[PDB]
Amino acid sequence: KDIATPIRTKEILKKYGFSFQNFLIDTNILNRIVDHAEVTEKTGVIEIGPGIGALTEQLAKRAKKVVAFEIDQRLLPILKDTLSPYENVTVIHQDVLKADVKSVIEEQFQDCDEIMVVANLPYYVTTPIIMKLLEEHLPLKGIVVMLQKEVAERMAADPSSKEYGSLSIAVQFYTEAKTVMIVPKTVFVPQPNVDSAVIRLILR
């Protein structure tokens, strides 16, 4: 049934006129992302960049609520369709860099014991969103994001590393950072240029 299966994803790409966002078409990987994010009946989840709902679905199954920030007008009718099975998924049409996320948390997660950000970001926006969120001083357990491996390498760099630098110091100032998955090129359609990684940031 799931959005992120190659047969279902392909029928969605036929329907809304998509052809050759890089799409995850493995349900296992997406569930491992949710696993590492520790999402339960207790958990509220902010997602950024839902796409067509592949990751959104898997989070929605486990969590009390999922609030999903999406900027592109064209993806809103698709999300209404693909994620219609879920009465716990609010799609906000806003740029998360502009939002007052503190007041969105109080408005949407009164029925929740902890809050996690979980995402799969494009390269150009990754570092800014992460950094906006950590600087905004929110009440989060943590942030699990899929980004490029070469960026993870620097975000979670150990101080002894040749790659430890300002980016490392920035992220580690606010969080304990660790890569928890390597996600290869071959698990996306179309195949991206490089391997990605899933980094987990737990706040202090």
PDB file of C-alpha atoms in Angstrom:
ATOM      1  CA  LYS A   1       0.000   0.000   0.000  1.00  0.00           C
ATOM      2  CA  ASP A   2       2.794   2.560   1.066  1.00  0.00           C
ATOM      3  CA  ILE A   3       3.622   5.859  -0.789  1.00  0.00           C
ATOM      4  CA  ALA A   4       7.312   4.975  -0.875  1.00  0.00           C
ATOM      5  CA  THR A   5       7.006   1.657  -2.795  1.00  0.00           C
ATOM      6  CA  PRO A   6       8.196   1.756  -6.424  1.00  0.00           C
ATOM      7  CA  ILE A   7       4.748   0.715  -7.846  1.00  0.00           C
ATOM      8  CA  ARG A   8       2.828   3.290  -5.764  1.00  0.00           C
ATOM      9  CA  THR A   9       5.393   6.103  -6.272  1.00  0.00           C
ATOM     10  CA  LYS A  10       5.356   5.506 -10.047  1.00  0.00           C
ATOM     11  CA  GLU A  11       1.500   5.725 -10.188  1.00  0.00           C
ATOM     12  CA  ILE A  12       1.800   9.034  -8.263  1.00  0.00           C
ATOM     13  CA  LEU A  13       4.433  10.303 -10.761  1.00  0.00           C
ATOM     14  CA  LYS A  14       2.093   9.326 -13.669  1.00  0.00           C
ATOM     15  CA  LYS A  15      -0.928  11.028 -12.015  1.00  0.00           C
ATOM     16  CA  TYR A  16       0.479  14.515 -11.212  1.00  0.00           C
ATOM     17  CA  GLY A  17       2.619  14.780 -14.376  1.00  0.00           C
ATOM     18  CA  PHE A  18       6.035  14.224 -12.707  1.00  0.00           C
ATOM     19  CA  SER A  19       9.064  12.851 -14.597  1.00  0.00           C
ATOM     20  CA  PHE A  20      12.901  12.610 -14.601  1.00  0.00           C
ATOM     21  CA  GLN A  21      13.097  16.222  -5.499  1.00  0.00           C
ATOM     22  CA  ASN A  22      14.962  12.857  -5.491  1.00  0.00           C
ATOM     23  CA  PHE A  23      12.454  10.212  -4.347  1.00  0.00           C
ATOM     24  CA  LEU A  24      13.079   7.556  -1.703  1.00  0.00           C
ATOM     25  CA  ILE A  25      11.510   4.275  -2.933  1.00  0.00           C
ATOM     26  CA  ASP A  26      12.507   2.080   0.014  1.00  0.00           C
ATOM     27  CA  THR A  27      10.144   1.744   2.951  1.00  0.00           C
ATOM     28  CA  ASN A  28      12.793   0.095   5.130  1.00  0.00           C
ATOM     29  CA  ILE A  29      15.184   3.047   4.989  1.00  0.00           C
ATOM     30  CA  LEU A  30      12.364   5.474   5.808  1.00  0.00           C
ATOM     31  CA  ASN A  31      11.408   3.339   8.789  1.00  0.00           C
ATOM     32  CA  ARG A  32      14.999   3.269  10.015  1.00  0.00           C
ATOM     33  CA  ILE A  33      14.894   7.091   9.898  1.00  0.00           C
ATOM     34  CA  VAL A  34      11.742   6.999  12.058  1.00  0.00           C
ATOM     35  CA  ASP A  35      13.400   4.361  14.359  1.00  0.00           C
ATOM     36  CA  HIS A  36      16.439   6.537  15.043  1.00  0.00           C
ATOM     37  CA  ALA A  37      14.129   9.500  15.576  1.00  0.00           C
ATOM     38  CA  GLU A  38      12.431   7.414  18.370  1.00  0.00           C
ATOM     39  CA  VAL A  39       8.873   8.379  17.304  1.00  0.00           C
ATOM     40  CA  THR A  40       6.036   6.922  19.494  1.00  0.00           C
ATOM     41  CA  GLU A  41       2.419   7.621  20.645  1.00  0.00           C
ATOM     42  CA  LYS A  42       4.108  10.261  22.911  1.00  0.00           C
ATOM     43  CA  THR A  43       5.921  12.016  19.977  1.00  0.00           C
ATOM     44  CA  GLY A  44       5.075  15.123  17.943  1.00  0.00           C
ATOM     45  CA  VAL A  45       6.926  15.546  14.658  1.00  0.00           C
ATOM     46  CA  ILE A  46       7.766  18.669  12.676  1.00  0.00           C
ATOM     47  CA  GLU A  47       8.661  17.631   9.101  1.00  0.00           C
ATOM     48  CA  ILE A  48      10.206  20.004   6.536  1.00  0.00           C
ATOM     49  CA  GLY A  49       9.924  19.383   2.777  1.00  0.00           C
ATOM     50  CA  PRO A  50       7.368  16.534   2.730  1.00  0.00           C
ATOM     51  CA  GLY A  51       7.654  15.894  -1.024  1.00  0.00           C
ATOM     52  CA  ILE A  52       4.831  13.530  -1.947  1.00  0.00           C
ATOM     53  CA  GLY A  53       4.542  12.109   1.613  1.00  0.00           C
ATOM     54  CA  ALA A  54       6.868   9.053   1.532  1.00  0.00           C
ATOM     55  CA  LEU A  55       8.613   9.857   4.807  1.00  0.00           C
ATOM     56  CA  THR A  56       5.549  11.741   6.112  1.00  0.00           C
ATOM     57  CA  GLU A  57       3.444   8.590   5.932  1.00  0.00           C
ATOM     58  CA  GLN A  58       5.861   6.451   7.955  1.00  0.00           C
ATOM     59  CA  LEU A  59       6.173   9.089  10.683  1.00  0.00           C
ATOM     60  CA  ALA A  60       2.400   9.652  10.723  1.00  0.00           C
ATOM     61  CA  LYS A  61       1.759   5.972  11.492  1.00  0.00           C
ATOM     62  CA  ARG A  62       3.731   6.050  14.746  1.00  0.00           C
ATOM     63  CA  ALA A  63       3.296   9.596  16.132  1.00  0.00           C
ATOM     64  CA  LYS A  64       0.516  11.488  17.983  1.00  0.00           C
ATOM     65  CA  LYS A  65       0.854  14.187  15.340  1.00  0.00           C
ATOM     66  CA  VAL A  66       2.929  15.281  12.316  1.00  0.00           C
ATOM     67  CA  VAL A  67       3.054  18.956  11.283  1.00  0.00           C
ATOM     68  CA  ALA A  68       4.646  19.349   7.845  1.00  0.00           C
ATOM     69  CA  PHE A  69       6.011  22.684   6.501  1.00  0.00           C
ATOM     70  CA  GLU A  70       5.838  22.855   2.628  1.00  0.00           C
ATOM     71  CA  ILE A  71       6.608  25.907   0.461  1.00  0.00           C
ATOM     72  CA  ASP A  72       5.659  24.750  -3.073  1.00  0.00           C
ATOM     73  CA  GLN A  73       1.994  25.405  -4.085  1.00  0.00           C
ATOM     74  CA  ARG A  74       1.948  22.392  -6.478  1.00  0.00           C
ATOM     75  CA  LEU A  75       2.600  19.785  -3.738  1.00  0.00           C
ATOM     76  CA  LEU A  76      -0.360  20.753  -1.491  1.00  0.00           C
ATOM     77  CA  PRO A  77      -3.127  19.022  -3.586  1.00  0.00           C
ATOM     78  CA  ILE A  78      -0.897  15.912  -3.892  1.00  0.00           C
ATOM     79  CA  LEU A  79      -0.335  15.696  -0.098  1.00  0.00           C
ATOM     80  CA  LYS A  80      -4.130  16.113   0.442  1.00  0.00           C
ATOM     81  CA  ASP A  81      -4.547  12.996  -1.794  1.00  0.00           C
ATOM     82  CA  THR A  82      -1.588  10.701  -0.812  1.00  0.00           C
ATOM     83  CA  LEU A  83      -1.883  11.352   2.951  1.00  0.00           C
ATOM     84  CA  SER A  84      -5.728  11.306   3.139  1.00  0.00           C
ATOM     85  CA  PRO A  85      -5.573   8.031   5.165  1.00  0.00           C
ATOM     86  CA  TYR A  86      -4.165  10.015   8.152  1.00  0.00           C
ATOM     87  CA  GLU A  87      -6.262  12.200  10.484  1.00  0.00           C
ATOM     88  CA  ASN A  88      -3.101  13.389  12.346  1.00  0.00           C
ATOM     89  CA  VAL A  89      -1.137  15.177   9.614  1.00  0.00           C
ATOM     90  CA  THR A  90      -1.475  18.985   9.282  1.00  0.00           C
ATOM     91  CA  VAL A  91       0.254  20.468   6.166  1.00  0.00           C
ATOM     92  CA  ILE A  92       1.388  24.056   6.780  1.00  0.00           C
ATOM     93  CA  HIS A  93       2.053  26.071   3.594  1.00  0.00           C
ATOM     94  CA  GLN A  94       4.892  28.217   4.893  1.00  0.00           C
ATOM     95  CA  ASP A  95       8.658  28.674   4.558  1.00  0.00           C
ATOM     96  CA  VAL A  96      10.012  27.256   7.856  1.00  0.00           C
ATOM     97  CA  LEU A  97      12.784  29.900   7.791  1.00  0.00           C
ATOM     98  CA  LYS A  98      10.074  32.593   8.314  1.00  0.00           C
ATOM     99  CA  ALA A  99       7.758  30.767  10.739  1.00  0.00           C
ATOM    100  CA  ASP A 100       7.491  31.342  14.456  1.00  0.00           C
ATOM    101  CA  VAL A 101       7.967  27.636  15.202  1.00  0.00           C
ATOM    102  CA  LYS A 102       7.724  28.245  18.995  1.00  0.00           C
ATOM    103  CA  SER A 103       4.078  29.388  18.677  1.00  0.00           C
ATOM    104  CA  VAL A 104       3.335  26.622  16.101  1.00  0.00           C
ATOM    105  CA  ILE A 105       4.479  24.011  18.687  1.00  0.00           C
ATOM    106  CA  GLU A 106       2.122  25.368  21.361  1.00  0.00           C
ATOM    107  CA  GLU A 107      -0.762  25.582  18.850  1.00  0.00           C
ATOM    108  CA  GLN A 108      -0.327  22.006  17.422  1.00  0.00           C
ATOM    109  CA  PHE A 109       1.337  19.707  20.043  1.00  0.00           C
ATOM    110  CA  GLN A 110      -0.647  20.276  23.285  1.00  0.00           C
ATOM    111  CA  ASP A 111      -1.373  16.487  23.135  1.00  0.00           C
ATOM    112  CA  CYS A 112       2.389  15.507  23.078  1.00  0.00           C
ATOM    113  CA  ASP A 113       5.205  14.560  25.564  1.00  0.00           C
ATOM    114  CA  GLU A 114       8.241  15.322  23.286  1.00  0.00           C
ATOM    115  CA  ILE A 115       8.996  17.062  19.926  1.00  0.00           C
ATOM    116  CA  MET A 116      11.286  15.901  17.090  1.00  0.00           C
ATOM    117  CA  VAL A 117      12.180  17.504  13.802  1.00  0.00           C
ATOM    118  CA  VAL A 118      12.570  14.911  11.037  1.00  0.00           C
ATOM    119  CA  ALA A 119      13.482  15.800   7.478  1.00  0.00           C
ATOM    120  CA  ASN A 120      15.002  15.067   4.153  1.00  0.00           C
ATOM    121  CA  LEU A 121      16.376  18.369   2.911  1.00  0.00           C
ATOM    122  CA  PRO A 122      17.870  19.541  -0.433  1.00  0.00           C
ATOM    123  CA  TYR A 123      21.490  20.661  -0.322  1.00  0.00           C
ATOM    124  CA  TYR A 124      21.076  24.479  -0.768  1.00  0.00           C
ATOM    125  CA  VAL A 125      18.709  24.763   2.265  1.00  0.00           C
ATOM    126  CA  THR A 126      20.029  22.102   4.675  1.00  0.00           C
ATOM    127  CA  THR A 127      22.469  24.078   6.862  1.00  0.00           C
ATOM    128  CA  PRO A 128      20.264  27.264   7.078  1.00  0.00           C
ATOM    129  CA  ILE A 129      17.111  25.413   8.328  1.00  0.00           C
ATOM    130  CA  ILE A 130      19.089  23.338  10.836  1.00  0.00           C
ATOM    131  CA  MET A 131      20.769  26.481  12.117  1.00  0.00           C
ATOM    132  CA  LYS A 132      17.632  28.633  12.144  1.00  0.00           C
ATOM    133  CA  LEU A 133      15.933  25.897  14.236  1.00  0.00           C
ATOM    134  CA  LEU A 134      18.733  25.559  16.786  1.00  0.00           C
ATOM    135  CA  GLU A 135      19.199  29.335  17.131  1.00  0.00           C
ATOM    136  CA  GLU A 136      15.409  29.791  17.607  1.00  0.00           C
ATOM    137  CA  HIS A 137      15.682  28.027  21.054  1.00  0.00           C
ATOM    138  CA  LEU A 138      12.732  25.638  20.659  1.00  0.00           C
ATOM    139  CA  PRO A 139      11.610  22.887  23.059  1.00  0.00           C
ATOM    140  CA  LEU A 140      12.880  19.890  21.001  1.00  0.00           C
ATOM    141  CA  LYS A 141      14.188  16.424  21.903  1.00  0.00           C
ATOM    142  CA  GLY A 142      16.196  16.432  18.653  1.00  0.00           C
ATOM    143  CA  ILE A 143      16.577  16.770  14.917  1.00  0.00           C
ATOM    144  CA  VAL A 144      16.974  13.786  12.555  1.00  0.00           C
ATOM    145  CA  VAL A 145      17.755  14.929   9.019  1.00  0.00           C
ATOM    146  CA  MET A 146      18.860  13.312   5.818  1.00  0.00           C
ATOM    147  CA  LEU A 147      21.502  15.484   4.156  1.00  0.00           C
ATOM    148  CA  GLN A 148      24.663  14.945   2.028  1.00  0.00           C
ATOM    149  CA  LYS A 149      27.324  12.661   3.620  1.00  0.00           C
ATOM    150  CA  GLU A 150      30.065  15.270   3.012  1.00  0.00           C
ATOM    151  CA  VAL A 151      28.020  17.796   5.112  1.00  0.00           C
ATOM    152  CA  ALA A 152      27.295  15.236   7.872  1.00  0.00           C
ATOM    153  CA  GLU A 153      31.030  14.494   7.948  1.00  0.00           C
ATOM    154  CA  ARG A 154      31.601  18.128   8.996  1.00  0.00           C
ATOM    155  CA  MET A 155      28.493  18.572  11.234  1.00  0.00           C
ATOM    156  CA  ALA A 156      29.233  15.499  13.392  1.00  0.00           C
ATOM    157  CA  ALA A 157      33.026  15.734  13.000  1.00  0.00           C
ATOM    158  CA  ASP A 158      34.968  14.694  16.092  1.00  0.00           C
ATOM    159  CA  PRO A 159      37.312  17.450  17.408  1.00  0.00           C
ATOM    160  CA  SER A 160      40.319  15.258  16.479  1.00  0.00           C
ATOM    161  CA  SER A 161      39.165  15.175  12.836  1.00  0.00           C
ATOM    162  CA  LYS A 162      40.850  17.059   9.975  1.00  0.00           C
ATOM    163  CA  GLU A 163      37.247  18.023   9.048  1.00  0.00           C
ATOM    164  CA  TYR A 164      36.424  19.643  12.418  1.00  0.00           C
ATOM    165  CA  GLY A 165      35.675  23.331  11.799  1.00  0.00           C
ATOM    166  CA  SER A 166      33.245  26.200  12.212  1.00  0.00           C
ATOM    167  CA  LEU A 167      30.278  24.172  10.924  1.00  0.00           C
ATOM    168  CA  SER A 168      31.104  21.406  13.431  1.00  0.00           C
ATOM    169  CA  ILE A 169      31.486  23.909  16.277  1.00  0.00           C
ATOM    170  CA  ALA A 170      28.195  25.595  15.343  1.00  0.00           C
ATOM    171  CA  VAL A 171      26.049  22.442  15.340  1.00  0.00           C
ATOM    172  CA  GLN A 172      27.815  20.843  18.325  1.00  0.00           C
ATOM    173  CA  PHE A 173      27.355  24.044  20.327  1.00  0.00           C
ATOM    174  CA  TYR A 174      23.636  23.357  20.479  1.00  0.00           C
ATOM    175  CA  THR A 175      23.566  19.556  19.964  1.00  0.00           C
ATOM    176  CA  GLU A 176      25.230  16.201  20.358  1.00  0.00           C
ATOM    177  CA  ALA A 177      25.707  15.268  16.675  1.00  0.00           C
ATOM    178  CA  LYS A 178      26.141  11.759  15.237  1.00  0.00           C
ATOM    179  CA  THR A 179      25.627  10.051  11.890  1.00  0.00           C
ATOM    180  CA  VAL A 180      23.282   7.096  12.402  1.00  0.00           C
ATOM    181  CA  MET A 181      22.819   5.924   8.725  1.00  0.00           C
ATOM    182  CA  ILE A 182      24.626   6.116   5.369  1.00  0.00           C
ATOM    183  CA  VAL A 183      22.070   6.216   2.594  1.00  0.00           C
ATOM    184  CA  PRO A 184      23.572   5.333  -0.788  1.00  0.00           C
ATOM    185  CA  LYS A 185      22.957   6.909  -4.203  1.00  0.00           C
ATOM    186  CA  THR A 186      21.193   3.805  -5.482  1.00  0.00           C
ATOM    187  CA  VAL A 187      18.180   4.040  -3.124  1.00  0.00           C
ATOM    188  CA  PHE A 188      16.793   7.209  -4.820  1.00  0.00           C
ATOM    189  CA  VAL A 189      15.084   7.826  -8.188  1.00  0.00           C
ATOM    190  CA  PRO A 190      16.651   9.527  -9.969  1.00  0.00           C
ATOM    191  CA  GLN A 191      20.035   8.593  -8.502  1.00  0.00           C
ATOM    192  CA  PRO A 192      21.613  11.644  -6.886  1.00  0.00           C
ATOM    193  CA  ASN A 193      25.203  12.814  -7.521  1.00  0.00           C
ATOM    194  CA  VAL A 194      26.455  11.645  -4.061  1.00  0.00           C
ATOM    195  CA  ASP A 195      25.730   9.435  -1.076  1.00  0.00           C
ATOM    196  CA  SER A 196      23.596  10.999   1.639  1.00  0.00           C
ATOM    197  CA  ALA A 197      23.606  10.313   5.381  1.00  0.00           C
ATOM    198  CA  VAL A 198      21.109  10.549   8.285  1.00  0.00           C
ATOM    199  CA  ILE A 199      22.416  12.692  11.118  1.00  0.00           C
ATOM    200  CA  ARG A 200      20.845  12.804  14.566  1.00  0.00           C
ATOM    201  CA  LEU A 201      21.191  15.950  16.626  1.00  0.00           C
ATOM    202  CA  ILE A 202      20.034  15.833  20.240  1.00  0.00           C
ATOM    203  CA  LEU A 203      19.732  19.249  21.910  1.00  0.00           C
ATOM    204  CA  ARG A 204      21.054  20.378  25.331  1.00  0.00           C
TER     205      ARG A 204
END
